[PDB]
Amino acid sequence: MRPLTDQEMKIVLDKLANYMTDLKSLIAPLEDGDRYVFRMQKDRVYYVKLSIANIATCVARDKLLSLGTCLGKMTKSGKFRLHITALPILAQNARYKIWVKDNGAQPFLYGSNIVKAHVGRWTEDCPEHSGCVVYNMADIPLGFGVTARSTAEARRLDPTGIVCFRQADCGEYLRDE
Amino acid sequence: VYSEKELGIPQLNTVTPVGVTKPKGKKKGKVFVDDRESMNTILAMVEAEKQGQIESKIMRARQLEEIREARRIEAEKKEAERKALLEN
Amino acid sequence: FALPTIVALKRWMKEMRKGNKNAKLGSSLVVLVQKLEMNAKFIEER
Amino acid sequence: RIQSEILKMVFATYFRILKARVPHLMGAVLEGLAKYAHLINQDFFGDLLEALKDLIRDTDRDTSRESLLCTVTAFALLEGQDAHNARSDLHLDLSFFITNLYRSLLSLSLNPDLELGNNKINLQTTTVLLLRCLTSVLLPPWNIRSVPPIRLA
RNA sequence: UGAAGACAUUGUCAGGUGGGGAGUU
């Protein structure tokens, strides 16, 4: 386990800036004085407390499996991909928000992209390819993805048209059981 | 269309300097950005790049002064760390 | 109820650490905010 | 053309008062500033929202009234219809004024000069300035149903 | 000489980890 370098943290924070607003809130000292840091273990980024990460040093490298909340993995080509295990962090400070109905939440959890007839609420003034976080009508976070068109463009859409490409949904927890 | 990383292209000295070039196929020594001040200065450029064009001249200046102040505070911490390393 | 008052004197300990030279008066308020924090803490479990 | 020349002389007097920090005059300046900012150029709207930020930081260095005056003026700028439709284009974020209003509520309860005996900014007492600030934050005329509940709580 | 105070800090052993630093193949 090692912390990120200059190149790795630029890539990680670039992916987080696509989906969130208050990125300085994440790197901010709390009441006790400790901070939240980033750790890398086996090509995987963990968003964990510094006090937790300091007392996890005594675990051997091969013998350590997880730490706090896993954001995602860095691939072989160097890109950083976000996972659904980062969704509570994304939902806390989501920039653009889309709400789906009960007839659209179940297709999303199976792995489908959001269709126009599934949407129950939009966020005004959303650009074309922006990072949105998907909720249901009960304000339960379901996943995140990228919008297909702008909000003004998607209001005129035929209701079988795609309004948000799916990237992660919380049915991935059923995959690893 | 192919990537410059795969081709063995030498680095060229421009107005942007080349700096000290690490040899190919050897240890590119990792420098860590665990420090919060070093985390803030990287965060300032990420937020500035995503925001883009601002019509206001004053708000465009404040977007740059935030990056400048982040660089100054990080440099003061690194100089104090260098002084502590020189003492040790 | 108490919370606006302790945070008021916490600023006051900051200015005297930076006014008068009343170390005896300064020490008496230190015990006073140590009291108010403790009874605030000790009531949160009930 | 005449409106351009009058707006230059009117706004120059406004900004020279804000620089000189005349207390009784700058209450009236913010009323004129909130009334007439939508006539002036689009680029200067974000400058006014940033000059108000610099004033609030200067009082943070009586002083409760100046900060609440500039806070209600910023909310009165985005109150207007044309400025509200330009939140996305003109990057006008009121997050500074919301957060500075939140951090000053404990200190405002302690200070005892909160009640001293048809405009919007130039009100006399600090309490009704606080009331009009919270009315803007918690009960906005636009998007009153799309308010973050965590900010409400 | 004023202030804090038997709590920190510090020191010695025995350990854990060490993708960072220095040496050998």
Q: Which two tokens stand for residue B7?
A: 């081709």
- The distance (Å) linking the CA of C37 with the C1' of E8 is 21
Backbone angles phi, psi at D72, to 5 degrees: -70, -25
Instruction: Determine which of A20, A22, A23, A77 to mutate to test the interface with B (most B C-beta atoms within 10 Å).
Output: A23
Chain B residues closer than 8 Å to A23 by CB: 43, 46-47
Q: What is the three-class DSSP state of A170?
A: coil
- The distance (Å) linking the CA of A162 with the C1' of E25 is 61
CA distance A145 to A168: 7
Which of these, A156, A149, A112, lies nearest to A129 by C-alpha position? A149
DSSP B37-74: HHHHHHHHHHHHHHH---S-HHHHHHHHHHHHHHHHHH
- The distance (Å) linking the CA of A59 with the C1' of E14 is 19
Which of these, A74, A122, A78, lies nearest to A98 by C-alpha position? A122
To 5 degrees, how large is the angle CA C40–CA C43–CA C46?
Answer: 160
- Cβ neighbours of A34 (radius 10 Å): 14
Chain D residues closer than 8 Å to B51 by CB: 91
Q: What is the three-class DSSP state of A115?
A: strand
Q: Which residue of A has its CA nearest to B51?
A: A17
Taking the CA of residue D112 and the nearest CA in chain B, the distance in Å comes to 36
Instruction: Determine which of A1, A9, A96 to mutate to test the interface with B (most B C-beta atoms within 10 Å).
Output: A9
Is the sign of the CA dihedral D59, D65, D71, D74 positive or negative? negative
Which of these, D111, D112, D135, lies nearest to D123 by C-alpha position? D135
Q: Which amino acid is at D16?
A: R
CA distance D127 to A98: 38
Scanning the structure block, which residue is given the tokens 């690194």? Answer: B78
Whether chain B has a CB inside 8 Å of the CB on D51: the answer is yes
Q: Is D92 exposed, middle or buried (0-12, 13-18, 19+ CB in 10 A)?
A: buried
Chain C residues closer than 8 Å to D109 by CB: 4
CA distance A136 to A103: 10
Interface contact flag, A27 B46, Cβ < 8 Å:
no
Scanning the structure block, which residue is given the tokens 């208050």? Answer: A22
How far is residue B48 from each of residues A132, B59, D89, measured CA to CA in Å?
Answer: 20, 11, 16
Q: Which two tokens stand for residue B79?
A: 């100089």
CA distance A42 to A56: 15
Taking the CA of residue D106 and the nearest CA in chain C, the distance in Å comes to 6
Which of these, A83, A95, A105, lies nearest to A172 by C-alpha position? A83
Backbone angles phi, psi at A106, to 5 degrees: -65, -45
- Cβ neighbours of A77 (radius 10 Å): 6
- Cβ neighbours of B79 (radius 10 Å): 10
Q: Please report the resolution in angstroms.
A: 2.7
Nearest nt to the C24 alpha carbon by C1': E3
CA distance D94 to D79: 11
Method: cryo-EM
Could you tell me whether strands A96-100 and A131-135 are parallel, antiparallel, or unpaired per DSSP bridges? parallel
Instruction: Determine which of D103, D107, D108, D111 to mutate to test the interface with C (most C C-beta atoms within 10 Å).
Output: D107
Beta bridge partners of A96: A132
Backbone angles phi, psi at B13, to 5 degrees: -80, 125
Is A131 in contact with A146 (CB distance < 8 Å)? Answer: yes
Which of these, A5, A91, A23, lies nearest to B34 by C-alpha position? A5
Scanning the structure block, which residue is given the tokens 């800036």? Answer: A17
Q: What is the three-class DSSP state of D47?
A: helix
Interface contact flag, B42 A10, Cβ < 8 Å:
yes
Q: What is the dihedral of CA D5, D9, D11, D14, to 10 degrees?
A: -170
Secondary structure in 3-state letters for A16-77: HHHHECCHHHHCCCCCCCCCEEEEECCCEEEEEEHHHHHHCCCCCCCCCCCCCEEEEEECCC
CA distance C16 to C13: 5
Beta bridge partners of A98: A134
Query: Do chains C and A meet with 3 or more Cβ pairs nearer than 8 Å?
Result: no
Is the sign of the CA dihedral B62, B63, B64, B65 positive or negative? positive
Strand order, beta sheet including A141-147: A114-115, A162-169, A141-147, A131-135, A96-100, A119-121
Whether chain A has a CB inside 8 Å of the CB on B9: the answer is no
Which of these, A138, A140, A143, lies nearest to A165 by C-alpha position? A143
Q: Which nucleotides of E are covered by protein (CB under 7 A)?
A: 2-4, 15-21
